[PDB]
Amino acid sequence: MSDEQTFIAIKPDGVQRGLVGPIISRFENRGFKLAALKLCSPSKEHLEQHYADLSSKPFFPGLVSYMLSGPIVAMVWEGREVVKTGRTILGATNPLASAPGTIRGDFAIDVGRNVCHGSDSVENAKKEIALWFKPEELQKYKHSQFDWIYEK
Amino acid sequence: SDEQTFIAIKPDGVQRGLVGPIISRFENRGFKLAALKLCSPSKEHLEQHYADLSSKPFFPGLVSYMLSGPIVAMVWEGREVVKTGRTILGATNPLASAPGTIRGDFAIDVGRNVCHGSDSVENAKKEIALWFKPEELQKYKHSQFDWIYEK
Amino acid sequence: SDEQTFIAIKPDGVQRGLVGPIISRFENRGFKLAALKLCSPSKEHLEQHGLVSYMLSGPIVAMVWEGREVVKTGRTILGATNPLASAPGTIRGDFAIDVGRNVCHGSDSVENAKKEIALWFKPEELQKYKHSQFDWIYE
Amino acid sequence: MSDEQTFIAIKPDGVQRGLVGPIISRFENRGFKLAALKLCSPSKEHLEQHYADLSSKPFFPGLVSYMLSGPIVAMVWEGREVVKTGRTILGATNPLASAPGTIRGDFAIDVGRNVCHGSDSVENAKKEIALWFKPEELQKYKHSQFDWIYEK
Amino acid sequence: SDEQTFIAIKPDGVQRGLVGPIISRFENRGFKLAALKLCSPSKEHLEQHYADLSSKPFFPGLVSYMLSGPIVAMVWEGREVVKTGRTILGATNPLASAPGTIRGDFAIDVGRNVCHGSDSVENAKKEIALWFKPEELQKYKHSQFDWIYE
Amino acid sequence: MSDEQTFIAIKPDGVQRGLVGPIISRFENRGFKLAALKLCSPSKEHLEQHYADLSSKPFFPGLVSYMLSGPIVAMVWEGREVVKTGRTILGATNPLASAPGTIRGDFAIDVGRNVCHGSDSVENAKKEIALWFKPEELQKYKHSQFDWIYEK
Secondary structure, three states, rough: OOOOOOEEEEHHHHHHOOOOOHHHHHHHOOOOEEEEEEEEEEHHHHHHHHHHHOOOOOOHHHHHHHHHHOOOEEEEEEOOHHHHHHHHHHOOOHHOOOOOOOOHHHHOHHHHHEEEOOOOOHHHHHHHHHHHOOOHOOOOOOOOOOHHHHOO | OOOOOOOEEOHHHHHHHHHHHHHHHHHOOEEEEEEEEOOOOOOHHHHHHHHOOOOOOOOOHHHHHHHHEEEEEEOOOOOOOHHHHHHHOOEEEEEEOOEEHHHHHHHOOOOOOEEEOOHHHHHHHHHHHHHHHHHOOOOOOOOOOHHOOOO | OEEEEEEEEEEEHHHHHOOOHHHHHHHHHOOOOEEEEOOOOOOOOOOOOHHHHOOOOOOEEEEEOOOHHHHHHHHHOOOOOOOOOOOOOOOHHOOOOHHHHOEEEEEHHHHHHHHHHHHHHHOOOOOOOOOOOOOHHHH | OOOEEEEEEHOOOOOOOOHHHHHHHHHHHHHOOOEEEEEEOOOOHHHHHHHHHHHOEEEEEEEEHHOOOEEEEEEEEEEEOOOHHHHHHHHHOOOHHHOOOHHHHOOOOOOOHOEEEOOOHHHHHHHHHHHHHHHHHOOOOOOOOHHHOOOO | OOOOOEEOHHHHHHHHHOOHHHHHHHHOOOEEEEEEEEEEOOOHHHHHHOOHHHHOOHHHHHHHHHOOOOOOEEEEEEOOOHHHHHHHHHHHHHHHHHOOOOOHOOOOOOOHEEEEOOOOOHHHHHHHHHHHHHHOOOOOOOOOOHHHHH | OOEEEEEEEEEEEEOOOOOHHHHHHHHHHOOOOOEEEEEEEEOHHHHHHOHHHOOOOHHHHHHHOOOOOOEHHHHHHHHOOOOHEEEEEOOOOOOHHHOEEEEHHHOOOOHOOEEEEOOOHHHHHHHHHHHHHHHHHHOOOOOOOHEEEOOO
């Protein structure tokens, strides 16, 4: 289905290195629809809930602490199989294992500075979308190019 | 420098897939993104925003077109950023705009001029207050501040 | 080599403003533009070649590209027939989502290319010139 | 007024230097509609009639032989004020008088290798379109983004 | 033709990752890259480069900022490249530069204007000899010369 | 470790096809530091010692003579795993085997015209760097965004 959504966050290093526009354009150019966008500085408790599936692991306080270093750009992109295609566009979580042409493959090196966060799954996406955005922040509109992007 | 300006990508800018390129122009120039959101403001909100045009005849047409899709509201910060933003955006009429500005590269009709930008410092302050709660403004130091600015 | 392939930008590619970027990827790689035209083919010019209902919904850009292994490399530049299976960095990997809106078509073989080329172009449309950078592109 | 047309040609130097894609992109990105497109090699008599208003100028014989030195991308672009806007996108006839961000300001040096031709008026544009294209080559269609490009 | 100019990417331009893009603007225009290096000139080298500004009160601050990080020095060759090199860079004060120019695209403060360009054919001759040895100046025919020039 | 180094050279076809800018951009954008850069025209004996392990093999006198046909942009790039990541950025030695998004898969066709040289290992990089560059041409400075690029 074409209304599938996914959560993308530009991490503090993505913002600080000036990669907002480029990252947005990779999703814009692919035909996905921008459903929500905001520059925010989430609470530690917010970030702890975001990564709660990693709360047991040793790098957790450092991950959360890193992610407070400055504002994050939170986005929802909408389209058919966008979560999986989002993951493909971002590249592998480890940038050194990413293909050139992907975001991390073009712009990143270290797993701890991998510029972007993408949902692992439709399941996680709905979870992460709900955490970072109120329903009113999700924009309901039809893509002007819908019928040229999708056949069904 | 701490000067701020208000840039909105209009519904045509969003629907024509220009959010990324518009943001890039400002990032590349050295300006700092202080606030960003995709919103769908109310009719009254856009009438407040365009109050200086309440008496004119295109005001109802303008307000309704601004109602026709999501808008990207942004605050950019830097020295002389409100005058320099107006230069990056180009002349209000895209056919009077130079190539290499946003409207010079992307727009044709003044009623589809893809971006809104504040016309003065004072008006930028009013528009930032109108579109953003103060907690939506982000306070951080740009990683390259001393490479961008001498003072 | 003067091997040729046939690349078409489908009407979704044209209507989505992808003519420029698609041409640049073949240009930057070192292939030679041998033929180019915006056309709206017949429904019969297309059955020797929702699918056909939409192959008529807009103009098509028809192209011949000349260079060594251009038919196999052309498929590589275009990417997998289904965009959701194609890599970022390919045309469909950067720009498309659905197979039925996969932006462009290219020949599947060197002999299908010759046949597709003779079908879309008259021999006078095929240009014969020497790429200005030929000797820097090939040995 | 929304369907004014103009004639843009990529000269043989533009073609040989790999500027076909980038030139077509400036017009595309601005919102103009590609109405006709072809790679062709016009005869000498063609080029002399195309440049008929400068047959008396000293450069005319070199102009024509250069215009014969390789294939040309001929195009028709359609939109409001497209002939005048297209002149501005192209930039001054002499590239050294041309602002960066125009085609000639970004890509050319010599007035005699200025990469592009564009018509100098609406009426002149109609004459050139009729000269280089048959009616059947001009595509008629609505641009998928018409209502976001124009208010009419 | 074959007139030469001196262009330098200042430390801010190098440190903000603008070396690729600046080079592309000259490359795309048709000018020929005659010489190129990333270097760190001495205080004395930089004071001589800016000699005609010993008088002014910003001179010592200028010199030290030009020492704050490596510099990419270049020679570009082509017809009127000195003047055209100046149009490409834009007004020395970026806020006076037009979008489309390097300073109008990338820069804000005149003290952080990412690029130096010779103000003159004569001064370009000086600056080129100052920054490069003869062995570093490459002489070769641009592969596209006849398509770039009449 | 983040001060690893690799040797990358833009071959004469690369320089002559106007790829100096785009190539440097690929590495800049990834977050690697440019440590040395020079346009040079090496001697034949210099180039012979560069390929000394292919002195016998038949490629040599043709490979050497082609590497002499025009000037070369020598570079050193610095970063974590930069020698292996540089090879990934360049693409396969045969451009027809490299994926789009790499340098050779975007710009090249012939293996004897693959626009770019990159060392095959950390050790060969050290050797190749010492061969092409004088120690004082290696610049020692801290990347302005080192802490946003690396978690070290």
